[PDB]
Design a binder for this molecule. Structure first.
Ligand SMILES: CCCCCCCCCCCCCCCCCCCC(=O)O[C@H](COC(=O)CCCCCCCCCCCCCC)COP(=O)(O)OCCN
Ligand SMILES: CCCCCCCCCCCCCCCCCCCC(=O)O[C@H](COC(=O)CCCCCCCCCCCCCC)COP(=O)(O)OCCN
Ligand SMILES: C[C@H](CCC(=O)NCCS(=O)(=O)O)[C@H]1CC[C@H]2[C@@H]3[C@H](O)C[C@@H]4C[C@H](O)CC[C@]4(C)[C@H]3C[C@H](O)[C@]12C
Ligand SMILES: C[C@H](CCC(=O)NCCS(=O)(=O)O)[C@H]1CC[C@H]2[C@@H]3[C@H](O)C[C@@H]4C[C@H](O)CC[C@]4(C)[C@H]3C[C@H](O)[C@]12C
Ligand SMILES: CCCCCCCCCCCC[N+](C)(C)[O-]
Ligand SMILES: CCCCCCCCCCCC[N+](C)(C)[O-]
Ligand SMILES: CCCCCCCCCCCC[N+](C)(C)[O-]
Ligand SMILES: CCCCCCCCCCCC[N+](C)(C)[O-]
Ligand SMILES: CCCCCCCCCCCC[N+](C)(C)[O-]
Ligand code: NA
Ligand code: NA
Length: 308
């Protein structure tokens, strides 16, 4: 009874706990630095969890309303990478920061958009369908768009990103999805444990990244945070207008706004740690985005839940 309520609070106060661990790692780097080589395994557990909660019925909307899901997928991969490039150009960001921002923008959407849409009284089915499709196609789209925006000079790194996404995202999702088919309704007991496990895995990624880049956060941390807010914020703005201008209903307009603005920034932190390890600042936009988008996502979801 107490253990279940503890998980409920932690989930409903995530951003605060993520901010506390990021702060703990900042003032004391050695507290989390050990988790650095575990980043792929940690993200691998989060992705296993996503697939475990996935069922073939979650793709119903993709077969019944394919144009609506396709608009959401296009919005995601056109808006977030282009906004990351535009902000990198307009703010003349140092190359390492620009690469970290572009990486975040090229990532697929985050699963927390599903919960935020539910609170925003949006179309939940659509949110789940957009995140899942954009995630399943991310092994090809994430490095291809990264390559076009960051430059063809990072070919080697982008090719390695394809392999990294297959291993940390695709391999665990499919596995989870087949385990749900194998056990059926029995997977509910496993899915009760995942919110706390997933929160523990992500705070360790955040902690490990902040710790490894303390010096770079000390000189550029505020600039990265300002870009994160503008990247995510503009993502909500263009997301809303993309849903509105395509003639989508109000429920779909709220889902796509959140979908676009919210990113799988834990993947961006994982890809920067695996492929730009000698430059710890590349993983910083991803680590700070993971804390920020949950704060901005909840505030926007609260405004809509209060309106509806
Ligand atoms: C720091 C930023 C954190 C975000 C605070 C959100 C507060 C609610 C904002 C709000 O009302 O925006 C909606 C616009 O879309 C949006 O979702 C725009 C949000 C964009 C955030 C600005 C960040 C830039 C930096 C309007 O929604 P409506 O349903 O009432 O509109 C009816 C159609 N006109
Ligand atoms: C980190 C900062 C710490 C601050 C967080 C404080 C916010 C608490 C707000 C809150 O819980 O209110 C909700 C309603 O909002 C309300 O209380 C509605 C206030 C009236 C809304 C008029 C629109 C103003 C919004 C402009 C927001 C700009 C903020 C940007 C800085 C509850 O949810 P619920 O009971 O209504 O939901 C039904 C469930 N689904
Ligand atoms: C379940 C949480 C939302 C809680 C909520 O619904 N609050 C509203 C309160 S109320 O109704 O008004 O009472 C969300 C918000 C932050 C999310 C987490 C963060 O985004 C960080 C990672 C992101 C990963 O992709 C999924 C696991 C995860 C660890 C997320 C799990 C879960 O979706 C969380 C914890
Ligand atoms: C585009 C232009 C108008 C859009 C249509 C309008 O948004 C009206 C409905 C909205 C429904 O959710 C799905 C079908 C749909 C018919 C949309 C399908 C697709 O997104 C369209 C056809
Ligand atoms: C005060 C509330 C703190 C906001 C926490 C936002 N959240 C649950 C999405 O992480
Ligand atoms: C339930 C766990 C799901 C399996 C997740 C698979 C994660 C693969 C990550 C291996 C990382 C090794 N490394 C760093 C050398 O690439
Ligand atoms: C699965 C992808 C479905 C795409 C169909 C797109 C609409 C074609 C008219
Ligand atoms: C555009 C990406 C498509 C994602 C693929 C989703 C797989 C679930 C689709 C249901 C397949 C099961 N079946 C054959 C019975 O329909
Ligand atoms: C920051 C927004 C506060 C969180 C709102 N709430 C409690 C409805 O999730
Ligand atoms: Na979603
Ligand atoms: Na997104």
């Amino acid at each position: 009874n107490i253990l279940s309520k503890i998980s409920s609070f932690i989930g409903k106060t995530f951003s605060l706990w993520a901010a506390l661990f990021a702060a703990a790692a900042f003032f004391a780097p050695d507290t989390f630095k050990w988790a650095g080589p575990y980043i792929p395994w940690l993200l691998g557990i989060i992705m296993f969890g996503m697939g475990l909660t996935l069922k073939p019925s979650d793709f119903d909307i993709l077969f019944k309303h394919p144009k609506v899901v396709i608009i959401g997928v296009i919005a995601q991969f056109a808006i977030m990478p282009a906004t990351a490039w535009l902000l990198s150009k307009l703010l003349n960001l140092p190359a390492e920061i620009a690469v970290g921002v572009i990486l975040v923008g090229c990532c697929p959407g985050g699963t927390a958009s599903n919960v935020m849409t539910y609170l925003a009284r949006g179309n939940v089915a659509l949110s789940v369908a957009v995140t899942s499709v954009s995630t399943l196609i991310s092994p090809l789209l994430t490095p291809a768009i990264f390559l076009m925006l960051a430059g063809e000079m990072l070919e080697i790194q982008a090719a390695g990103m394809l392999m990294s996404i297959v291993k940390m995202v695709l391999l665990p999702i499919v596995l989870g999805l087949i385990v749900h088919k194998v056990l059926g309704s029995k997977t509910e007991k496993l899915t009760d444990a995942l919110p706390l496990v997933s929160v523990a895995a992500i705070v360790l990624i955040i902690g490990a990244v902040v710790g490894a880049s303390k010096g770079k956060i000390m000189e550029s941390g505020l600039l990265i945070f300002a870009v994160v807010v503008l990247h995510n914020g503009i993502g909500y703005l263009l997301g809303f207008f993309a849903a509105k201008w395509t003639g989508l209903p109000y429920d779909a307009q709220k889902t796509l706004t959140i979908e676009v603005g919210m990113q799988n920034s834990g993947l961006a932190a994982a890809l920067a740690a695996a492929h730009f390890a000698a430059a710890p600042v590349v993983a910083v936009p991803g680590a700070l985005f993971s804390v920020w988008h949950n704060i901005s996502g909840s505030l926007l979801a609260t405004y809509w839940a209060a309106k509806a």
